[PDB]
């Protein structure tokens, strides 16, 4: 089980999307194109709605099939966007998590993507998550997206 933390070098907002949210679109698209079914775990319902819109536009000139959890075809869309209240569809290969605290369901996945936001006020939360992935037996690494 591997957990990768992407280091953000900015907190530049575009079209109502946080720098992390923008990165999520790029990573979800890349992972789906590699042949994976993807779960995006949002912190809240409103963030799920933002990403459901954004993934039709980002990356540009791309068709990335996706839906909110509970919507789309049977078994869910190739990329599914869930939030704490919402049961996600199963048989997914990679979790991209926006949850501010470690989510117990993360242990269901062999590949997890998490983030270290640029804002100092968000660093403590990120450190806490990193610790919790370690306790749950994940092999940890940090990376910069290209």
């Amino acid at each position: 089980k591997n957990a990768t933390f992407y280091l953000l070098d900015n907190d530049t907002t575009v079209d109502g999307l946080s720098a992390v949210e923008q990165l999520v679109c790029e990573i979800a698209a890349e992972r789906w194109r590699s042949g994976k079914r993807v779960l995006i775990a949002c912190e809240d319902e409103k963030q799920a709605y933002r990403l459901d819109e954004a993934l039709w536009a980002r990356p540009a000139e791309s068709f990335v099939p996706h839906n909110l959890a509970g919507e789309g075809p049977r078994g869910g869309a190739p990329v599914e966007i869930a939030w704490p209240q919402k049961r996600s569809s199963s048989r997914r290969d990679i979790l991209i998590s926006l949850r501010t605290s470690f989510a117990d369901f993360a242990t269901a996945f062999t590949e997890v993507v998490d983030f270290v936001p640029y804002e100092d006020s968000l660093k403590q939360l990120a450190r806490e998550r990193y610790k919790a992935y370690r306790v749950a037996g994940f092999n940890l690494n940090t990376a910069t997206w290209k």
Binding site: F5, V116, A126, R127, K131
Partner: peptide, 4 residues
């Protein structure tokens, strides 16, 4: 050890 946390690298950030």
């Amino acid at each position: 050890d946390i690298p950030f």
